[PDB]
Enzyme design. Structure first.
Site, PDB file in Angstrom:
ATOM      1  N   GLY A 174      17.513  25.502 -33.187  1.00 23.98           N
ATOM      2  CA  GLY A 174      17.537  26.951 -33.475  1.00 23.98           C
ATOM      3  C   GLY A 174      18.653  27.414 -34.395  1.00 23.98           C
ATOM      4  CD  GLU A 204       9.223  34.578 -33.326  1.00 24.58           C
ATOM      5  OE1 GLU A 204       9.506  34.213 -34.482  1.00 24.58           O
ATOM      6  OE2 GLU A 204       8.251  35.304 -33.046  1.00 24.58           O
ATOM      7  CG  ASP A 205      12.674  27.883 -31.088  1.00 24.04           C
ATOM      8  OD1 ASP A 205      12.642  28.222 -29.889  1.00 24.04           O
ATOM      9  OD2 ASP A 205      11.921  27.024 -31.590  1.00 24.04           O
ATOM     10  CB  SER A 206      17.377  32.970 -33.118  1.00 25.70           C
ATOM     11  OG  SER A 206      16.224  32.938 -33.943  1.00 25.70           O
TER      12      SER A 206
END
Ligand SMILES: [Zn+2]
Lengths: 49, 49, 196, 79, 87, 753, 209, 147
Positions: C13, H106-108
């Protein structure tokens, strides 16, 4: 890489410690590049006489 | 099935450095072992079946 | 803001904002989290090993010993690691009570926090970033090339030359394809169509 | 004459006109409704369309080859 | 054959000039029947007598930053023809 | 922004605390798993003892699988039920699933229950090591855990044996992500060249570049698919008794009218027959409508994608005008009937006064109009919606604004838009639809449709049994075999060429008893008997299904080579039904023995005992789903489904297959496009392709509006021959040289040009 | 079976009649409805060793609109087809003086015969339908829309409303099964009317080439 | 017991030696999904950290060291074998699985400006450039000089 079928890429059961199952690259090279398990040791070669 | 003569289910052997496929009994005879019995025991070891 | 960071359990991420210690959720002893990974990512993908190592790392940190997580150790069911964490005084299952940093009010739901190894992937935004405008042009074909600064722009390939027809936008297509890459005016004879 | 084309403006003729009218205003063209605290050519021209007053006539060539020529005022503003 | 057509009623390679001459005699109406349109296309026009040389632009000269002027390859083809044509 | 602020004052976080469960559930799940181990062990012993029965149309090994897969699949689900039930109203995992933002009910099961069975290629992990699945197990092991079931849940962790299996199971997904990645642009890139320039030209004729009319009015309705939403037609499904009961505006009750409507209208409605006639004609028009709709939508779906949504609009109108539903109406029922007509005149997909341009408007809006008439009908408006005069006016006006605005915009690139819209799901579908015999779907099948390659993985023709036969499988079964091709190999029990110089030689006595009967009338035996002859044995179990008769076998064997083959049937009662066939007695009257060996092989292969040759396998399934049940409008006026046997068969020979008696020749169709063109014509291909694409984008549950479906299925079948539209199929095209210089022959086409 | 041949023949004929009623040739509803048992009564138990002669199934009918033009169905008794036999029928037609007629070729025909049918290119036009094809009425099958045909006058009007040159119209080739069943010829527009879900009935007019 | 078998000839040294040199840096691999572990071995072929200990004399193109590589608090027993408490590839982070301001969806990952300021993940990106003097010309020499 592009033989239509994917017979070789599918992990065969005979890779019990021969190859690391988890380590597979993602892309056009999927399951056609494998890495050895920590304890395998490929034979160097001897004379059978 | 086509033709392939009266004989069917014929064992046939491609070999290195040839042109057309060679019938197997011939190759064996050519190596030698002309006796048809010799060829048979060299392949099927037990005649009981 | 943009650099990939990723854990050891398959979750990758980029950063989305960074915030200073004061304006971040804080534990009641002062421990502000250095990374706040999203809860939604864990479910669909089921990495329920990242959350176990989150618990064991806390147990290991308070007991001061590297904690072993061999694939199969038998001495690590989720419950056994948890009971050790309970003595130190935390929720047996890892949750801790945090407070919103900007307002100070206690976030109702008790956030799950802990120590987890993070690896900083090589890929960085600076390498990826490309930009172009009136950039160097190849004299032979007069269509954009690349000089310093990565001035070679992106390509309007056929796939994206076709959504534009679908949207019906002719003038953008004419602009992107002609004006933007190769605008030329050539004087042509009228009686014969040869150049002049 | 016999207009056979639809009375309403087409989704795409409200785009080429809003844009064309705008290159005119920016180039110093006369304006056709009051503009208040407004200096942006599209906002000045999207406003005119609201009032049916832009100076343009649209040649909708029919498939066979004949140019029916509807005018901005007659066309019904679809938005 | 490859670059030459030989005709046997007596079998000889066909002269480009002679074939050009035959096309010069070719009737425009017959060419229209052939399907070629005479105004923009003539069989006589087909044979090449003058080689169009493309302009310097289509064959640019790459000076690699002052090393010297490497000639564009196409120039080489034009050059050999000139040396041979002159001789 | 507001809900993000609410998340700040509340927060959401998933933790190990949510992946653990109460000991009751942890033990309750174990007991369900222990049962699987017990039950599977029962199947193994039953088969290991040979007690297990074979199953209709399936191999014994497959039966073991069908039975074991049943016991394991219930176990994932039952241990699934107990697990979800325990999670509270605070379990974080559950909130994410219920919101639908992330997670699945199966995901919750794999993290608190039983990871479930792991599989490779739609089977169980296969024996790869000789008779084992990994070294540790003993050979011939059919244990569920050993074969592939990973009983341990993710939180518990996987034992090393199952970890390997889980990896094998994942590998196929990572192998798919790569097969999916390449086909991403394959279909659209090819299709767009074929639908490169269809546009809705200014008079609405969707037309290609040459100006040829691919579709006369866009999508057949003229409505562009953005403003159209699904509504229930409301008249097709209801029973005849109901159709009158629901819509009628009876002028008879009076008291009912008294409650429903204002009195002033009430006396007049009773007073004027002219008012009453309009009502009876009105219901009559609808009676006529139901009849048309019943054929137009035969199966019984009531969902259409017609434009302005009348139902919501009535409701919206009810609020804007603050109608109170408990008190009497103000709308003269007649106002409605004239009002509907007024709307109908105004909404025009086509606007030509002459007939040929007046017929079309009726055709185009017949569905919407029938809906307007059913929803705005006065009896209903007066009773169900109870609208008022000021409000009816907003409603008619609004329906017209939306309908008139829904017409497609002229100059739309409907062609290019349609090709990309179809492509998105083409990528979504599975790699080959082995699982969900075999059906081929996904981008491979969509390819067979894009470029018309006849060869299919599963050329198949469904067969709808004509009638009485389907009700009873006995008639059905014979017909099913009747079509199937059968030959000597299938029914043969044994073949032989013993030497018998004379008939009475009878090398085998069992043949002699009926050989004596042949010898009793050895007609033509006087010419001779084969010194060496072929004797053929067959097994009744194979023969019984065929319901084969030896006489049939005999006449046909005789009918082919000729009197050159002579045979007398064995007694049917005799268990050893045998055919003793010898060469022509006159021929006995090149070596015959060798000739017979060849004869035996050809005879065995081309018997064609019964049935069309190409079809090779027929499977018969009564259809539990409503997908193909014959649906009949009943006498009382109802749609109901009749369960009738349907015979799905491989191979394609519609002409003969359709030719055979009792094969309804109305509803039996191939799954293959080439066959349809040859025997039913181009127009059938156009309706058939739509069905073929719709099947493909139904497996997903995806929808593509018909508009896009018709254009791909009409542009392709347009010049009159099915056109392959892969880069090769449309590579030949009517185009300017610059357009035909678009494909690799740029140097050559131009020189010719 | 011989009984099967009767069953098959009855059906072949049954559909053949319908084609004419549809093509516009005059046929009694009674003839179309003749039941198989009636067929047996009318022509006999079996062509083989029975009354049906493989001949007499042949029939001549004229347009309901016009008695002047008649079409003669010929079911050649000979399973294979010889041109002379057609020539004999042609002579029979020359006497009939009616151009329209059809041949139910049972199995196969001499290639020369087919060219010979073309040889009388405008003379006594005749058409060949394989016996197998006539067994099933393609027009009643689900995927087949209800093709209808148009007079030359209607064609002109259609072009005018849409201002379409005929080449631009969608094209249906004559060889396709539906066309032969409606007896189509080049240059003639057969409209196709079909139920479609978004609207109701869309009627697409296709010209032939 | 009721043995699955009694004839076992050979028994395995430890079953977790069936995993290679980059899936042994992952703890609890069985607990995680198998595709996620494959994706992480791929991510490891990406993570930086100290490359080899002669970074100062080696001069390869594109080589990034990290300011403070740290040995992991949770360690697979078999990492030691692959020199990982000598060449670690990341830092233990006080991570907290939660939804905060939104920038974490969202994958942050959100991150602490203060900690990336006390050194957390600081790195150097070495990139070597080489120019060779060419004497290819008969008279053309690419000499080295201050133009
Ligand atoms: Zn000129």
């Amino acid at each position: 890489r592009d033989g239509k079928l994917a017979k070789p890429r599918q992990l065969h059961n005979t890779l019990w410690g021969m190859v690391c199952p988890a380590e597979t690259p993602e892309g056009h090279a999927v399951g056609l590049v494998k890495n050895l398990a920590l304890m395998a040791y490929i034979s160097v070669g001897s004379q059978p006489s | 099935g086509a033709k392939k003569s009266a004989i069917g289910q014929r064992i046939v052997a491609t070999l290195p450095y040839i042109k057309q496929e060679v019938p197997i009994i011939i190759v064996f005879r050519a190596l030698g072992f002309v006796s048809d019995r010799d060829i048979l025991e060299h392949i099927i070891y037990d005649f009981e079946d | 803001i943009g650099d990939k960071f990723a854990s050891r359990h398959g979750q990758k991420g980029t950063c989305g904002i960074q915030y200073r210690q004061e304006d971040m959720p804080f534990t009641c002893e002062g421990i502000t989290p250095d990374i706040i990974i999203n809860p939604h990512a864990i479910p669909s993908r089921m990495t329920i090993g990242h959350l176990i190592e989150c618990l064991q790392g806390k147990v290991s940190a308070n007991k001061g010993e590297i904690g072993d997580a061999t694939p199969f150790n038998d001495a690590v069911n989720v419950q056994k690691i948890s009971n050790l964490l309970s003595d130190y005084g935390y929720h047996l299952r890892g949750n801790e009570v945090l407070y919103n940093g900007f307002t100070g009010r206690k976030i109702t739901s008790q956030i799950f926090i802990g120590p987890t190894y993070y690896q900083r992937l090589k890929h960085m935004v600076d390498d990826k970033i490309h930009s172009r405008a009136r950039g160097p042009i190849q004299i032979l074909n007069r269509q954009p090339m690349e000089g310093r600064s990565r001035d070679g722009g992106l390509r309007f390939g056929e796939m994206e030359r076709d959504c534009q027809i679908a949207h019906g936008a002719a003038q953008f297509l004419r602009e992107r394809l002609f004006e933007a890459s190769d605008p030329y005016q050539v004087h042509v004879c009228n009686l014969c169509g040869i150049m002049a | 004459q016999k207009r056979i084309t639809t009375p309403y403006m087409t989704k795409y003729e409200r785009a080429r006109v809003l844009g064309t009218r705008a290159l005119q205003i920016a180039m110093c063209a006369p304006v056709m409704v009051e503009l208040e605290g407004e200096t942006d050519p599209l906002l000045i021209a999207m406003k005119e369309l609201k009032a049916r007053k832009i100076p343009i006539i649209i040649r909708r060539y029919l498939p066979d080859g004949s140019y029916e020529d509807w005018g901005v005022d007659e066309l019904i503003i679809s938005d | 054959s490859g670059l030459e057509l030989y005709a046997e009623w007596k079998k000889i390679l066909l002269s480009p000039e002679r074939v050009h001459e035959i096309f010069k005699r070719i009737s425009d109406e017959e060419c229209f029947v052939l399907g070629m349109e005479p105004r923009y296309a003539r069989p006589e026009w087909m044979i090449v007598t003058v080689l169009p040389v493309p302009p310097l632009s289509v064959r640019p000269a790459v000076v690699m930053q002052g090393s010297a002027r490497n000639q564009d390859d196409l120039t080489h083809k034009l050059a050999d023809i000139v040396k041979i044509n002159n001789q | 922004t507001v809900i993000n602020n609410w998340l700040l004052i509340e927060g959401h976080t998933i933790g190990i605390g949510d992946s653990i469960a109460d000991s009751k559930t942890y033990q309750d799940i174990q007991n369900t798993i222990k049962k699987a181990k017990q039950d599977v062990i029962e199947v193994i012993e039953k088969a290991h003892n040979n007690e297990l029965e074979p199953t209709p149309g399936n191999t014994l090994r497959q039966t073991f699988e069908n039975q074991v897969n049943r016991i394991l699949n219930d176990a994932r689900d039952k241990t699934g039920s107990s697990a979800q039930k325990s999670l509270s109203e605070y379990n974080n995992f559950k909130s994410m699933v219920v919101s639908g933002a992330k997670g699945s009910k199966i995901n919750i099961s794999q993290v608190i229950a039983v990871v479930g069975q792991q599989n490779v290629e739609g089977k169980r992990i296969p024996f790869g090591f000789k008779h084992r699945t990994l070294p540790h197990f003993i050979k011939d092991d059919y244990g569920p855990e050993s074969r592939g079931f990973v009983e341990n849940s993710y939180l518990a962790g996987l034992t090393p044996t199952e970890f390997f299996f889980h990896a094998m199971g994942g590998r196929e997904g990572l192998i798919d992500t790569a097969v999916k990645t390449a086909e991403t642009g394959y279909i659209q890139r090819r299709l767009i060249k074929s639908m490169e320039s269809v546009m809705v030209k200014y008079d609405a004729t969707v037309r290609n570049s040459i100006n040829q009319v691919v579709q006369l009015r866009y999508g057949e309705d003229g409505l562009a698919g953005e403003s159209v939403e699904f509504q229930n037609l409301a008249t097709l499904k209801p029973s005849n008794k109901a159709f009158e009961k629901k819509f009628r505006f009876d002028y008879t009750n009076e008291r009912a009218l008294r409650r429903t409507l204002q009195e002033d209208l009430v006396k007049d409605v009773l007073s004027n027959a002219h008012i009453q006639n309009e009502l009876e004609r009105e219901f009559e028009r609808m009676r006529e409508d139901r009849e048309v709709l019943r054929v137009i939508f035969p199966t019984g779906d009531s969902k259409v994608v017609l434009p302005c949504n009348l139902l919501r609009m009535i409701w919206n109108a009810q609020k804007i005008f603050h109608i109170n539903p408990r008190l009497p109406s103000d709308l003269h029922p007649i106002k409605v009937v004239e009002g509907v007509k007024e709307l109908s005149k105004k909404l025009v997909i086509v606007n030509g006064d002459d007939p040929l341009s007046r017929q079309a408007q009726e055709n185009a809006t017949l569905l919407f109009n029938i809906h307007l008439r059913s929803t705005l009908c006065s009896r209903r408006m007066a009773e169900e919606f109870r609208l008022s005069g000021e409000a009816f006016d907003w409603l008619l006006g609004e329906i017209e604004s939306k309908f008139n605005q829904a017409i497609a915009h002229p100059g739309e690139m409907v062609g290019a838009l349609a090709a990309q819209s179809l492509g998105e799901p083409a990528t979504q579908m599975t790699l080959n639809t082995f699982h969900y015999k075999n059906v081929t779907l996904g981008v491979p099948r969509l390819k067979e449709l894009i470029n018309i390659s006849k060869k299919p993985k599963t050329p198949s023709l469904t067969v709808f049994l004509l009638g009485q036969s389907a009700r009873d499988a006995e008639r059905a079964k014979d017909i099913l075999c009747r079509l199937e091709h059968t030959t000597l190999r299938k029914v043969t029990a044994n073949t032989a060429i013993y030497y018998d110089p004379n008939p009475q030689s009878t090398v085998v006595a069992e043949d002699q008893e009926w050989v004596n009967v042949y010898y009793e009338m050895p007609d033509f035996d006087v010419a001779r008997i084969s010194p060496w002859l072929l004797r053929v044995e067959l097994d009744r179990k194979h023969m019984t299904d065929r319901k084969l008769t030896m006489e049939q076998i005999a006449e046909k064997i005789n009918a082919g080579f000729g009197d050159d083959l002579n045979c007398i049937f064995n007694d049917d009662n005799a268990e050893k039904l045998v055919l003793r066939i010898r060469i022509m007695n006159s021929d006995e009257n090149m070596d015959d023995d060798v000739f017979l060996r060849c004869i035996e092989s050809n005879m065995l292969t081309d018997m064609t005992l019964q049935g069309i040759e190409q079809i090779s396998k027929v499977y018969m399934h009564l259809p539990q789903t409503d997908n193909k049940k014959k649906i009949i409008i009943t006498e009382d006026g109802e749609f109901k489904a009749l369960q009738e046997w349907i015979l799905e068969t491989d191979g394609v020979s519609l002409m003969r297959v359709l030719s055979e008696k009792d094969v309804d020749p109305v509803r039996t169709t191939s799954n293959d496009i080439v066959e349809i063109f040859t025997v039913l014509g181009i127009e059938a291909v156009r309706k058939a392709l739509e069905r073929e694409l719709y099947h493909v984008i139904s497996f997903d549950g995806s929808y593509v509006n018909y508009r896009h479906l018709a254009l791909l299925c009409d542009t392709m079948t347009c010049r009159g021959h099915l056109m392959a539209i892969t880069r090769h199929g449309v590579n030949r095209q009517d185009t300017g040289p610059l357009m035909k210089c678009s494909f690799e022959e740029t140097v050559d086409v131009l020189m010719e040009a | 079976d011989d009984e099967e041949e009767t069953y098959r023949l009855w059906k072949i004929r049954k559909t053949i009649m319908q084609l004419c009623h549809d093509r516009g040739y005059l046929v009694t509803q009674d003839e179309l409805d003749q039941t198989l048992e009636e067929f047996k009564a009318q022509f006999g138990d079996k062509p083989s060793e029975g009354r049906p002669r493989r001949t007499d199934l042949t029939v001549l009918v004229a347009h309901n609109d016009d008695p002047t033009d008649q079409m003669f169905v010929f079911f050649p008794e000979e399973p294979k087809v010889g041109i002379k036999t057609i020539k004999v029928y042609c002579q029979r037609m020359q006497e009939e003086n009616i151009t329209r007629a059809l041949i139910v070729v049972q199995q196969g025909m001499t290639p020369s015969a087919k060219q010979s049918l073309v040889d009388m290119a405008p003379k006594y036009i005749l058409e060949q339908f394989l016996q197998q094809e006539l067994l099933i009425n393609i027009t009643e099958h689900e995927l087949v829309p209800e093709h209808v045909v148009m007079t030359k006058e209607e064609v002109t009007e259609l072009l005018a409303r849409y201002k379409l040159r005929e080449n631009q119209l969608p094209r249906i080739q004559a060889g396709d099964p539906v066309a032969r069943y409606f007896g189509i010829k080049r240059g003639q527009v057969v409209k196709i009317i079909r139920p479609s879900e978004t609207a109701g009935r869309y009627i697409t007019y296709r010209l032939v080439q | 017991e009721v043995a699955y078998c009694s004839t076992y000839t050979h028994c395995e040294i430890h079953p977790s030696m069936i995993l290679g040199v980059c899936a042994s840096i992952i703890p609890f691999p069985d607990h995680n999904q198998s595709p996620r572990n494959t994706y992480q071995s791929a991510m490891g072929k990406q993570a930086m950290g100290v490359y080899i200990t002669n970074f100062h004399v080696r001069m390869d193109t594109l080589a990034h060291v990290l300011y403070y590589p740290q040995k992991p608090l949770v360690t697979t027993r078999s990492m030691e074998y692959l020199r990982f408490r000598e060449l670690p590839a990341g830092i233990n982070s006080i991570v907290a699985i939660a939804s905060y301001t939104g920038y974490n969806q969202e994958d942050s990952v959100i991150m602490n400006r203060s900690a990336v300021d006390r050194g957390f993940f600081r790195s150097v990106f070495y990139r070597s450039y080489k120019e060779q003097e060419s004497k290819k010309g008969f008279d053309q020499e690419e000499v080295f000089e201050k133009p």
